[PDB]
Amino acid sequence: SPSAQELKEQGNRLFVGRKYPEAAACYGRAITRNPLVAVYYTNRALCYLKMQQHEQALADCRRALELDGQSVKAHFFLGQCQLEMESYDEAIANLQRAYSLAKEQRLNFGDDIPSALRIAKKKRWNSIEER
Numbered sequence: 001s002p003s004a005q006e007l008k009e010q011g012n013r014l015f016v017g018r019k020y021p022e023a024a025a026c027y028g029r030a031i032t033r034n035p036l037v038a039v040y041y042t043n044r045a046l047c048y049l050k051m052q053q054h055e056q057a058l059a060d061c062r063r064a065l066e067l068d069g070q071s072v073k074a075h076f077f078l079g080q081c082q083l084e085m086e087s088y089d090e091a092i093a094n095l096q097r098a099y100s101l102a103k104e105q106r107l108n109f110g111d112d113i114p115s116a117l118r119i120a121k122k123k124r125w126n127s128i129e130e131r
């Protein structure tokens with residue numbers, strides 16, 4: 001009988017091993033034990049994004065944000081999901097929000113957030129210029 005935290009860690013390990021459906025199933029088992037922990041939904045959202053399930057990834061970002069509105073990771077993954085869905089304005093605003101929250105929380109992700117923002121902004125510009 002694994003605990004919710006053991007299942008979340010098993011999910012993280014499987015994600016690093018590129019076993020995305022198995023990792024998402026582990027996060028689901030963690031949610032069964034404790035459905036009020038935001039990171040179980042944020043981490044499963046990234047599995048759904050890797051599995052090209054954008055609507056499920058969006059839904060899990062929403063569940064995470066209803067539990068932890070200060071989540072840098074929920075905003076970052078939501079922006080990455082929206083970028084793949086071509087919802088450019090929303091993607092940029094969520095990535096900008098992850099940047100501000102990371103700065104307020106003194107979290108260091110190297111250049112990941114500004115790099116993701118430049119990628120999203122360039123994709124938006126090119127899509128508008130080429131219609």
Ligand SMILES: CN(c1nnc(-c2c[nH]c3c(F)c(F)c(F)c(F)c23)o1)[C@H](CCN1CCCC1)c1ccccn1
Binds near residue numbers: 012112
């Ligand atoms: C990969 N990972 C992970 N946690 N945070 C990021 C991340 C990278 N860049 C970011 C970024 F720019 C942001 F703004 C932001 F908010 C972020 F959260 C991030 O990535 C974990 C595993 C963690 N591991 C163990 C200790 C270190 C590594 C995870 C996530 C989902 C599923 C499975 N596992």
